[PDB]
Design a protein around this motif. Structure first.
Motif, PDB file in Angstrom:
ATOM      1  N   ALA A  18       0.834  -1.201   0.000  1.00  0.00           N
ATOM      2  CA  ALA A  18       0.000   0.000   0.000  1.00  0.00           C
ATOM      3  C   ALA A  18       0.870   1.253   0.000  1.00  0.00           C
ATOM      4  CB  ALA A  18      -0.884   0.009   1.227  1.00  0.00           C
ATOM      5  N   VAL A  19       0.553   2.211  -0.858  1.00  0.00           N
ATOM      6  CA  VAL A  19       1.341   3.435  -0.877  1.00  0.00           C
ATOM      7  C   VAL A  19       0.796   4.387   0.188  1.00  0.00           C
ATOM      8  CG1 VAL A  19       2.362   5.170  -2.327  1.00  0.00           C
ATOM      9  CG2 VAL A  19       1.349   3.161  -3.372  1.00  0.00           C
ATOM     10  N   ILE A  20       1.594   4.699   1.203  1.00  0.00           N
ATOM     11  CA  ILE A  20       1.145   5.618   2.247  1.00  0.00           C
ATOM     12  C   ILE A  20       2.225   6.655   2.514  1.00  0.00           C
ATOM     13  CG2 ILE A  20      -0.110   3.729   3.318  1.00  0.00           C
ATOM     14  CD1 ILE A  20       1.932   3.916   5.690  1.00  0.00           C
ATOM     15  N   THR A  21       2.044   7.434   3.568  1.00  0.00           N
ATOM     16  CA  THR A  21       3.019   8.452   3.920  1.00  0.00           C
ATOM     17  C   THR A  21       2.831   8.836   5.374  1.00  0.00           C
ATOM     18  OG1 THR A  21       3.751  10.736   3.483  1.00  0.00           O
ATOM     19  CG2 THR A  21       1.419  10.234   3.172  1.00  0.00           C
ATOM     20  N   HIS A  22       3.901   9.308   6.000  1.00  0.00           N
ATOM     21  CA  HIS A  22       3.820   9.750   7.380  1.00  0.00           C
ATOM     22  C   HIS A  22       3.649  11.261   7.374  1.00  0.00           C
ATOM     23  CE1 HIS A  22       5.871   5.901   9.115  1.00  0.00           C
ATOM     24  NE2 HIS A  22       4.673   5.679   8.603  1.00  0.00           N
ATOM     25  N   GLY A  23       3.568  11.805   6.159  1.00  0.00           N
ATOM     26  CA  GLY A  23       3.332  13.225   5.956  1.00  0.00           C
ATOM     27  C   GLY A  23       4.502  14.186   5.948  1.00  0.00           C
ATOM     28  N   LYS A  24       5.736  13.687   5.974  1.00  0.00           N
ATOM     29  CA  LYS A  24       6.877  14.606   5.986  1.00  0.00           C
ATOM     30  C   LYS A  24       7.529  14.769   4.616  1.00  0.00           C
ATOM     31  CE  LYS A  24       8.157  13.761  10.844  1.00  0.00           C
ATOM     32  NZ  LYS A  24       8.626  12.348  11.048  1.00  0.00           N
ATOM     33  N   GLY A  25       6.773  14.496   3.554  1.00  0.00           N
ATOM     34  CA  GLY A  25       7.328  14.665   2.221  1.00  0.00           C
ATOM     35  C   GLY A  25       7.791  13.420   1.476  1.00  0.00           C
ATOM     36  N   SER A  69      -0.227  -4.210   7.329  1.00  0.00           N
ATOM     37  CA  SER A  69       0.463  -3.414   8.338  1.00  0.00           C
ATOM     38  C   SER A  69       0.116  -1.941   8.286  1.00  0.00           C
ATOM     39  CB  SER A  69       1.970  -3.572   8.191  1.00  0.00           C
ATOM     40  OG  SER A  69       2.367  -3.218   6.884  1.00  0.00           O
ATOM     41  N   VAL A  70      -0.893  -1.600   7.490  1.00  0.00           N
ATOM     42  CA  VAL A  70      -1.351  -0.221   7.351  1.00  0.00           C
ATOM     43  C   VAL A  70      -1.942   0.258   8.684  1.00  0.00           C
ATOM     44  CG1 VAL A  70      -2.930   1.312   6.132  1.00  0.00           C
ATOM     45  CG2 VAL A  70      -1.883  -0.593   4.915  1.00  0.00           C
ATOM     46  N   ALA A  71      -2.606  -0.663   9.372  1.00  0.00           N
ATOM     47  CA  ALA A  71      -3.244  -0.390  10.651  1.00  0.00           C
ATOM     48  C   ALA A  71      -2.308   0.240  11.692  1.00  0.00           C
ATOM     49  CB  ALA A  71      -3.837  -1.681  11.193  1.00  0.00           C
ATOM     50  N   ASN A  72      -1.185  -0.420  11.947  1.00  0.00           N
ATOM     51  CA  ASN A  72      -0.197   0.040  12.924  1.00  0.00           C
ATOM     52  C   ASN A  72       0.407   1.379  12.527  1.00  0.00           C
ATOM     53  OD1 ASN A  72      -0.267  -2.811  11.970  1.00  0.00           O
ATOM     54  ND2 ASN A  72       0.543  -3.186  14.046  1.00  0.00           N
ATOM     55  N   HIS A  73       0.473   1.618  11.220  1.00  0.00           N
ATOM     56  CA  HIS A  73       0.997   2.868  10.704  1.00  0.00           C
ATOM     57  C   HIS A  73      -0.030   3.952  11.021  1.00  0.00           C
ATOM     58  CE1 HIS A  73       4.699   1.987   8.476  1.00  0.00           C
ATOM     59  NE2 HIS A  73       4.183   0.793   8.245  1.00  0.00           N
ATOM     60  N   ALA A  74      -1.297   3.653  10.746  1.00  0.00           N
ATOM     61  CA  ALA A  74      -2.389   4.580  11.013  1.00  0.00           C
ATOM     62  C   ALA A  74      -2.348   5.022  12.474  1.00  0.00           C
ATOM     63  CB  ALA A  74      -3.724   3.915  10.704  1.00  0.00           C
ATOM     64  N   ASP A  75      -2.179   4.063  13.381  1.00  0.00           N
ATOM     65  CA  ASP A  75      -2.117   4.386  14.802  1.00  0.00           C
ATOM     66  C   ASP A  75      -0.936   5.321  15.088  1.00  0.00           C
ATOM     67  OD1 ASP A  75      -4.350   2.769  15.608  1.00  0.00           O
ATOM     68  OD2 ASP A  75      -3.071   0.990  15.632  1.00  0.00           O
ATOM     69  N   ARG A  76       0.270   4.865  14.751  1.00  0.00           N
ATOM     70  CA  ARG A  76       1.482   5.640  14.980  1.00  0.00           C
ATOM     71  C   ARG A  76       1.438   7.066  14.441  1.00  0.00           C
ATOM     72  NH1 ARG A  76       3.923   1.259  12.915  1.00  0.00           N
ATOM     73  NH2 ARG A  76       5.486   2.308  11.593  1.00  0.00           N
ATOM     74  N   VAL A  77       0.870   7.238  13.251  1.00  0.00           N
ATOM     75  CA  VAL A  77       0.788   8.557  12.630  1.00  0.00           C
ATOM     76  C   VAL A  77      -0.253   9.441  13.315  1.00  0.00           C
ATOM     77  CG1 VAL A  77      -0.842   7.715  10.923  1.00  0.00           C
ATOM     78  CG2 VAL A  77       0.409   9.813  10.491  1.00  0.00           C
ATOM     79  N   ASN A 128       2.928  21.816  13.145  1.00  0.00           N
ATOM     80  CA  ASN A 128       2.409  20.455  13.036  1.00  0.00           C
ATOM     81  C   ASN A 128       1.753  20.226  11.671  1.00  0.00           C
ATOM     82  OD1 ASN A 128       0.105  18.305  13.388  1.00  0.00           O
ATOM     83  ND2 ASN A 128       1.443  17.952  15.170  1.00  0.00           N
ATOM     84  N   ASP A 129       2.528  20.477  10.614  1.00  0.00           N
ATOM     85  CA  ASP A 129       2.081  20.303   9.232  1.00  0.00           C
ATOM     86  C   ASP A 129       2.017  18.829   8.862  1.00  0.00           C
ATOM     87  OD1 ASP A 129       1.494  22.516   7.249  1.00  0.00           O
ATOM     88  OD2 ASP A 129       3.267  23.385   8.247  1.00  0.00           O
ATOM     89  N   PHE A 130       1.272  18.529   7.802  1.00  0.00           N
ATOM     90  CA  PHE A 130       1.142  17.158   7.340  1.00  0.00           C
ATOM     91  C   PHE A 130       0.881  17.113   5.854  1.00  0.00           C
ATOM     92  CE2 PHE A 130      -0.339  12.997   6.443  1.00  0.00           C
ATOM     93  CZ  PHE A 130       0.116  12.171   7.457  1.00  0.00           C
ATOM     94  N   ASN A 131       1.871  16.624   5.121  1.00  0.00           N
ATOM     95  CA  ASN A 131       1.751  16.520   3.686  1.00  0.00           C
ATOM     96  C   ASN A 131       1.057  15.217   3.315  1.00  0.00           C
ATOM     97  OD1 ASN A 131       2.039  16.327   0.939  1.00  0.00           O
ATOM     98  ND2 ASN A 131       4.094  17.242   0.938  1.00  0.00           N
ATOM     99  N   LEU A 132      -0.050  15.345   2.590  1.00  0.00           N
ATOM    100  CA  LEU A 132      -0.839  14.200   2.161  1.00  0.00           C
ATOM    101  C   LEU A 132      -0.261  13.585   0.893  1.00  0.00           C
ATOM    102  CD1 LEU A 132      -4.553  15.512   2.500  1.00  0.00           C
ATOM    103  CD2 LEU A 132      -3.339  14.017   4.134  1.00  0.00           C
ATOM    104  N   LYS A 176      -6.435  15.297   9.222  1.00  0.00           N
ATOM    105  CA  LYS A 176      -5.993  16.680   9.081  1.00  0.00           C
ATOM    106  C   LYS A 176      -7.162  17.602   9.376  1.00  0.00           C
ATOM    107  CE  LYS A 176      -3.091  18.518   6.562  1.00  0.00           C
ATOM    108  NZ  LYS A 176      -2.545  19.287   5.411  1.00  0.00           N
ATOM    109  N   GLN A 177      -8.366  17.117   9.086  1.00  0.00           N
ATOM    110  CA  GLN A 177      -9.587  17.876   9.332  1.00  0.00           C
ATOM    111  C   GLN A 177      -9.874  17.879  10.830  1.00  0.00           C
ATOM    112  OE1 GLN A 177     -12.712  16.226   6.741  1.00  0.00           O
ATOM    113  NE2 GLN A 177     -11.220  16.251   5.056  1.00  0.00           N
ATOM    114  N   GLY A 178      -8.963  17.275  11.588  1.00  0.00           N
ATOM    115  CA  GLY A 178      -9.099  17.223  13.031  1.00  0.00           C
ATOM    116  C   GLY A 178     -10.253  16.387  13.540  1.00  0.00           C
ATOM    117  N   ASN A 179     -10.312  15.121  13.137  1.00  0.00           N
ATOM    118  CA  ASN A 179     -11.378  14.238  13.599  1.00  0.00           C
ATOM    119  C   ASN A 179     -10.821  13.278  14.633  1.00  0.00           C
ATOM    120  OD1 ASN A 179     -13.333  13.795  10.523  1.00  0.00           O
ATOM    121  ND2 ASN A 179     -12.202  15.558  11.334  1.00  0.00           N
TER     122      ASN A 179
END
Ligand SMILES: Nc1ncnc2c1ncn2[C@@H]1O[C@H](COP(=O)(O)OP(=O)(O)NP(=O)(O)O)[C@@H](O)[C@H]1O
Ligand SMILES: Nc1ncnc2c1ncn2[C@@H]1O[C@H](COP(=O)(O)OP(=O)(O)NP(=O)(O)O)[C@@H](O)[C@H]1O
Ligand SMILES: Nc1ncnc2c1ncn2[C@@H]1O[C@H](COP(=O)(O)OP(=O)(O)NP(=O)(O)O)[C@@H](O)[C@H]1O
Ligand SMILES: Nc1ncnc2c1ncn2[C@@H]1O[C@H](COP(=O)(O)OP(=O)(O)NP(=O)(O)O)[C@@H](O)[C@H]1O
Ligand SMILES: Nc1ncnc2c1ncn2[C@@H]1O[C@H](COP(=O)(O)OP(=O)(O)NP(=O)(O)O)[C@@H](O)[C@H]1O
Ligand SMILES: Nc1ncnc2c1ncn2[C@@H]1O[C@H](COP(=O)(O)OP(=O)(O)NP(=O)(O)O)[C@@H](O)[C@H]1O
Lengths: 308, 308, 308, 308, 308, 308
Positions: free
Chosen positions: A216-223, A232-240, A250-254, A272-275
């Motif tokens: 899966a192509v994802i990102t932690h948002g730092k470029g 393993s997308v799940a654990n990434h989602a949590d950590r991020v 506290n910027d986040f590049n999508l 990012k929409q703060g949910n």
């Protein structure tokens, strides 16, 4: 891990210089009986110099700990030195100091920088300037964004005019490798921080569908993109999300929406929409409506290419 | 072993400098046919320089001797050099000389000092001054008392604000290791030669009851504790008494009575009172009246700590 | 082997300097097709410099030769250099040259000198002067006699005030070792070339009767004893006689008659009297009249010493 | 070691059969807490059968004992079986039993018998009868004398029409080898228990003077010679005297006086005369009057033989 | 693990016989695509026979699982056979069957039984009857209590007339070893299920205070003691309570109150009284009132014994 | 390779029995000088029996051939025996014989059958009947179609109720492995030769799109699928067409059109229509019109499954 796990402060003419810990001094401390009011103050081994505050016991692997790091390897020394070289060029002041060392950095990124630094073929071997830029980014002391040239490195498995894909070698690490021998992860850095043609983006996606279909192509948002297994997308989602939570600083590049996996793009732009986590994460598991494929026939082409 | 086993005197401008023996010259001597009136005079191998007086044959391991030392190892050279460096800084005179070399030192302590000296993490690696203080103490040319900083070293298994506990590595020694593979001994040095709070003494005893319950806390009286098996207190008692006997030249520190094993404290304070061996030793085997435990509940606490 | 097997002459300012052969150049020559009129002239490999005259093929081990030397080892280079260093200090002239190189030397003696030379414990390591004296003696360019200090070396198995006994290590040699794995030989050098007390001679004989009873004390007549097996005195007798034969250029030291084996003393003094081989050798096999033992009870004493 | 270290008694139809111990049962016992009144009674491991009485702890090597035997090897089993096979053919009775097992035997002799027994080339491999005769002699259940055919074996280094010389291989033993790696001992057995010509005795002495000059010919008095180093005659003298002491149950063969070392012959015949140890042993250290050599020129002949 | 992980049922003449799984068939299944309604029904690999129901995937180690067992080892086969041999002697019926296989057993206990079974020195090697009794107890098909003779085995480190202490070798196991290399556990079985004198109980406690002071004496309530580290009593408390919870089918032996650790005795007798986990567990962490030591001076005696 | 490479005919009572070649006899022949009129007649090594006709030199690997097979391995013997066992059960006649041996079989299939045959877990180990059916199919002496049970085997990486997917282990073969270390191929056999539900076909395709996206589903037309890299479909197309060409003796199963890769289905059904190679092959390289995906969302589902 905190930067205070690799070095301690020292005033030398109004400015603070950072010194590496002796693994034997750390060992001494893991043995020490300290009072609860000194757990935050550096430790004196007497025989091998200063050691990290006793409260960091958890960061070091012993017989009762494999969750920490292997401070007895040469990599630890090497990583410490890499850090100290960076923090010393900053001429940090008697106030910003504690905040600096308490910064949590990624050791794998730091060890990967050492692997680059010590290879005579790597540009970082010859650019003591580029090396610092690369390190400062790693220890969060640089506004700059990580790009190929300043990337943590690894094994190049794809290269474009826009991107460079690296295979993370975290398993073969000495300091703190991934223990899950079933691990595999890739990182895509932007060669240059600028506009990218659709043809070049098409070239990358083509590769990621053919060569990394189970990823899966994802990102932690730092470029930069992270190519991880779907399992393993799940654990990434949590950590991020957790990291976004600590937004009290506290910027986040999508990143490109045509590249990032649909669900991840949703889960993140939602965040990012703060949910809430449950709101966001919910978007990660739901089979969304088939979006309009931007590049059609990508796989069909690559397939015919092969056949010929 | 006498210091004359590692070097010989040499006049160089009114003062004596000490030179290390070549293991091959020692070998030559062990082969030599010397007259009984030259057994005390240094030996000339002709081919490899001077060697120790023939009367020291017993100090060197051959095929008919395992009671001596392994003079053919690099450790022998290293230990010789460590000794010579110390004796040379003293600028010894044409009279005090013979008495100096005839001094019997502990080789294990000397080899342990070399292990410290050659480790770049050890403070002794950087302090050529502290190194001498540490060596001179070892060869009995210093009034000073051995403390942690100047300790023979080994493996730190406990550290306090008052004490540092070392595990003696005598088995892994090259020059003259302990042959009894069943050997285990510890040494507790005082970090500083000064007053010690009861809380800090309580911390140490706590450790020695929990971690070393099968060991007896004793001392040879030179300022440091020796943690030995109860099944070996006897041989220590003999060796220490024997040494007290040679009191024709003789202080003896009994160390904290709350730490030292009751029987040993008795056996020694009895000896200091100038009694006979049979009188003293007798105190070592008799089950004495349960003294009033100074620190109660020590084990019970540590136990609960564990459970949590 | 001729010295011309290790180097070739070269005029550099009216004087000749000697240069070592490249093992690869020697190999080239062993491959070369030379004319019969050039078999005595040095060979040009073109690629690896000069090589020994083709007529020396026999001195080098190939697949069809084990009778020669192992010129491809580092020892060959080392031995060549040892020779060249000696011949260069002589500033040999355009006439004495050919005669010099044609000199036949003992390679084992030369390799043994290298083993001494390269050991930092050996006095030869520090005396570039003693080293030359030792080498020149070996290549027959010194009137001086070989004594302990200038001995070829080996393993010291006995030392007196008069003698030093060496165990020849010819088997463990690299250049040209003894192939007969059943080989054992000893050499006794005189510590000093001067008078020797009877007590000191008694000490030596005592050792040679107790420790080397199955060995015969002989000599090649150049000032040192050779301790060889009785089952090999014959071949020595031949070799020594053969060498005496070439007396067209010739002193012979019979050495102490109380030490040398009776038959050998006879065989040699007979030869010195200028007799025939059959006449001499005959004396070697005949059981002669029990001479009057100079030192009685030698073995009986040493025996009791042991028992106690 | 007592035979009770390898097996225990068992009544099976009015007669006692002997059973081998399981090394694991022995291990269990070395762990057991037995009462002082049961130290002489066999032990029940429950899990691995019976084990030797606790009072035999000393016979088995542990971490605190190297003075015992290696009961965990297959040799122990093999030796046990060798013993049991012998004791079972005797059909021992309910009274002679305890006395039998308490018999102290030589383990090296027993292991040497196993080495013979298991070699298909050895006559003992094919003669289950000769094997018993050989074993019974070893465990003191045979009036018969040990001769070549029934010898403990080892490596034959000389053979006559009268004698066979064996090199004891005690060092390469598995069960209880000699630890002194500097050990060497030989045994001369009589091929036949009968008259021996002087020529045959001359042949043997010839060999023992030439090949074993540094060895003393002695005997323990049971019909065979022991060739030991002179530096070890003392300990033999003690051991043999000690055994004579237990004469409460006692013949002693002095063997040929022309072979046995003069001092030993004196020390023993003196002991047979029922004297004190100090009286006897005194004869061992005194240089006695040169007796009249029975075979003159022995060495001189062998020497010339060699030369030819 | 369920017994259904090692075998499957099979009707052969009104009675069910149990057959071992082929590791390759298990592998096939871990690969299989089964429907959710067949997850409980045995699987047919076609090529290697039947395999366990797909719902047991978790019990087998793969690349994504280390929480299971190593079914590809010979131990798996061996353990399966051990189970099948036991279940077949029961002649189980068409109704009790499913309940039997669903029984959860301890694999370490089963592998330990195999280690006993295959050792020719172990009584279980010779008693096919005792072997069954030992196995049936292990798989919960025996009212009988586990005692030394039928114990799972391991290494005996203490033996009394009442008890046998075993060192659990779970780390060196092949099928499903303890992964925590820092693991150490002991088990004390009663030699006989009957009255035990106070002296014998005193002997055991003496050993457990001297040799295992850092260990807590506890029990799982089935008749045997478990010697575990205090730093692991917690997890035991949970596991034992959890098992008590499933009391819908439930005796619990608290064992000697003079042996069992005070807190554990409280925590368990409290649980037997049918309390809550929080109520019980609470008793485990509270430093209770020093109970009246039943055997005083135990350690003081053992200590003096050592010294002598 | 012809079956005549592994054995030769032999009349034994009106019927022909087949005998395996000795690798040494084959070696002899590869050495032999045969006349051109005997190149087709079996060869007599004299020393090692009969060998294949000289005209088969090419089938055996020598120093000038790696294109053949490794007849010197045990696998050759094993494969020969596998063949002979099959041909002997046929009781072939004096006419059908030559035609039988000239049959070209796939060695990898034969070696794979041996690997199955020798594994005790494989059903073929126990069914000497199923083994023959499996072999006869392999050597073209069976009308029957290869299904899972009679499959050549390999490593199972997927199993359905309809299919079993095997990973061909051709690289680890001994007799004639694939040399291209970059090789990977899979085979899908039908568990049963009967109707297959769409759900079961959907399960398979799901796996082949997710796990083997870089692979093309094809078939050689004998009832089983072959999963090969797209970069190798070409060579398969040639080989299969070539075989169709030899249609002078010829059915061809196109297999499920929903599974087989579109282009391959075209290329083959085109070939079945009896067209030319260029006509057919042309269909293989042309990007055809996106057919109507029978199972949509397959990958999207599997993807979400992973994520959870
Ligand atoms: C945890 O979290 C740490 C940091 O996450 P990490 O995988 O290094 O991403 P990152 O460094 O924050 N960002 P990036 O490199 O830009 O994708 C890891 O080292 C894990 O062990
Ligand atoms: C003997 O006696 C020698 C000296 O005793 P040792 O164990 O070194 O204590 P010490 O050096 O005299 N004192 P200390 O180090 O202050 O406890 C040892 O090396 C033994 O082999
Ligand atoms: C032959 O002859 C050569 C020379 O004899 P050698 O044994 O070296 O005695 P030497 O050098 O002439 N004399 P010396 O060393 O004084 O006893 C040997 O190297 C043999 O191989
Ligand atoms: C001790 O004493 C034991 C017995 O002495 P040993 O050397 O076996 O002579 P022996 O068996 O009594 N007699 P013999 O074999 O006739 O010379 C040895 O095994 C030593 O370890
Ligand atoms: C979990 O729980 C399983 C069973 O607990 P276990 O340690 O085997 O005690 P137990 O067999 O139930 N009783 P016991 O042997 O009588 O003390 C272990 O194998 C752990 O991995
Ligand atoms: C060539 O051609 C030979 C036979 O092709 P092969 O790959 O064995 O397919 P096949 O056996 O004819 N059919 P199938 O097994 O039904 O797919 C191989 O062994 C290659 O080396």
């Amino acid at each position: 891990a905190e930067l205070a796990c690799f070095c301690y402060p020292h005033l030398e003419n109004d400015s603070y210089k950072f010194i590496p810990f002796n693994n034997l001094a750390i060992k001494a401390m893991l043995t020490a009986k300290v009072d609860k009011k000194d757990m935050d103050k550096f430790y004196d081994s007497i025989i091998y110099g200063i050691a990290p505050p006793p409260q960091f016991k958890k960061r070091y692997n012993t017989n009762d700990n494999s969750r920490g790091m292997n401070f007895e390897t040469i990599m630890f020394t090497k990583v410490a030195m890499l850090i100290c070289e960076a923090l010393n060029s900053l001429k940090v002041t008697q106030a910003n100091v504690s905040n600096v060392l308490s910064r949590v950095v990624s050791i794998r990124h730091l060890e990967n920088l050492v692997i680059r630094k010590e290879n005579p073929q790597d540009i970082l071997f010859h650019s003591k300037d580029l090396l610092l830029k690369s390190t400062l980014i790693a220890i969060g002391q640089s506004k700059e964004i990580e790009t190929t040239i300043t990337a943590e490195g690894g094994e190049i498995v794809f290269q474009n005019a826009a991107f460079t894909m690296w295979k993370l070698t975290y398993l073969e690490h000495q300091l703190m490798p991934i223990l899950d021998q079933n691990f595999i992860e890739y990182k895509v850095t932007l060669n240059e921080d600028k506009p990218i043609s659709d043809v070049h983006v098409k070239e990358l996606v083509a590769e990621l569908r053919w060569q990394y279909n189970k990823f899966a192509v994802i990102t932690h948002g730092k470029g930069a993109y992270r190519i991880v297994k779907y399992s393993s997308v799940a654990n990434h989602a949590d950590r991020v999300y957790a990291t976004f939570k600590s937004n009290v600083k506290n910027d986040f590049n999508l990143l490109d929406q045509r590249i990032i996996w649909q669900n991840w793009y949703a889960f993140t732009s939602s965040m990012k929409q703060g949910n809430t986590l449950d709101v966001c994460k919910r978007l990660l598991f739901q089979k969304m409506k088939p979006e309009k494929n931007p590049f059609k026939g990508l796989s069909t082409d690559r397939k015919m290419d092969e056949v010929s």
